Structures are given as C-alpha cells and as structure tokens.
Structure 1
Amino acid sequence: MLKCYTCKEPMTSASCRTITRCKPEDTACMTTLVTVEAEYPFNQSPVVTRSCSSSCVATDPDSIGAAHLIFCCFRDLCNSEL
C-alpha cells in the first residue's frame, strides 16, 4: 500500500518522519510546509505535517490551517525529509 512519512499528530516542531500506511483508496501523499510560527510550543526549526491524500494538487484556498506549501507525490516515501 501507499506509505508516507507521516507522524502521529502536529505537536513536535520536528522529527515528523514515520513510515505510515495510507488507505487503500488513497494513492498519493501530502505535505504541509510552514516555517512561520505563532506561539509555543515551537522550535528554531520549521514545522510540517504530512498526511495521506487521494488527489495530489497544489492549491492554497483558505489556508486557514497553516496550509502554505503543499508538497504531494505518487510514490511511497517519495520524500524522506522532515
């Protein structure tokens, strides 16, 4: 199945690289790259949240959930970055 480096939940400033198995219907990975930071908890390094997706597309509609950069792919662990 589709495997993407998705962590548990958006809490740790970094170290968000865990091999997670996506759903059978999904065939693409999604990543939210955001350097900006509001208030703690936080760190010197940037923060991102990778999650499974069934349609890799780059578009910033509302971006209310800090969805600035959207990096998606169609390969397991296409990116081994934080």
Structure 2
Amino acid sequence: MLKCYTCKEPMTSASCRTITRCKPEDTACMTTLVTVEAEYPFNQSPVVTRSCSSSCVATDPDSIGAAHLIFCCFRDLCNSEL
C-alpha cells in the first residue's frame, strides 16, 4: 500500500517524519511546507503537514490564496526529509 512520512502531531511537531500507511482510496502523497516568517528573517518552528492524497496536484507560485508549497508524489516515502 501507499506509505507516506506522515506525522501523528500537527504542524506543532518538529520533525514531521513518520512511516504511515495511506488509505486504499488514495493513490499519491501530499506535503505542506510554509515557514513561520517568510517576509522577515526569523528562525522558528515552521508549519508543515504531510498527508496522503488521491490526486497529486500543485498550485501556482503566486501563493496569493493560501497556496503554500504543496508537494506530492506517487511513491512510498518518495521524500524522507521534511
């Protein structure tokens, strides 16, 4: 089955990297990447959330409508890093 590095805790979690089994309805994986402070320099606990998906898709680089870095793949553990 499709396995993605989905963490149990929300963005609050530090290293969101845990081997989890996706659902049968799904097919691809998803990943949310959005720093806490992009407008100004501030190194702090970032906001991310990796979850399975039934359709790997991405938005525009505009990110005008809450369209952060939405990565996706069709391979188990396609990405180990955050």
TM-score if structure 2 supplies the norm length? 0.77
Percent same amino acid at aligned positions?
A: 100
TM-score if structure 1 supplies the norm length? 0.77
Ranges in structure 2 where 5+ consecutive residues have no aligned partner? none
Q: Tell me if structure 1 keeps the 8 A contact 2:11–2:48.
A: no
Comparing 30-39 with 55-64, greater Cα deviation is found at 55-64
- How far is the alpha carbon of 1:78 from its aligned partner? 0.2
Whole-Å separation in 2 of the counterparts to 1:67 and 1:38: 14
Whole-Å separation in 2 of the counterparts to 1:65 and 1:13: 24
- How far is the alpha carbon of 1:51 from its aligned partner? 0.3
Counterparts in 2 of 1:52 and 1:64: CA distance versus 1, 3 Å: farther
Comparing 12-21 with 26-35, greater Cα deviation is found at 12-21
Whole-Å separation in 1 of the counterparts to 2:41 and 2:2: 31
2:74 is matched with 74
Ranges in structure 1 where 5+ consecutive residues have no aligned partner? none
Q: Tell me if structure 1 keeps the 8 A contact 2:36–2:44.
A: no
Aligned residues: 82
CA RMSD between the two structures: 3.8
The higher radius of gyration belongs to: 2
- How far is the alpha carbon of 1:55 from its aligned partner? 0.2
Q: Secondary structure at the match of 1:30?
A: strand
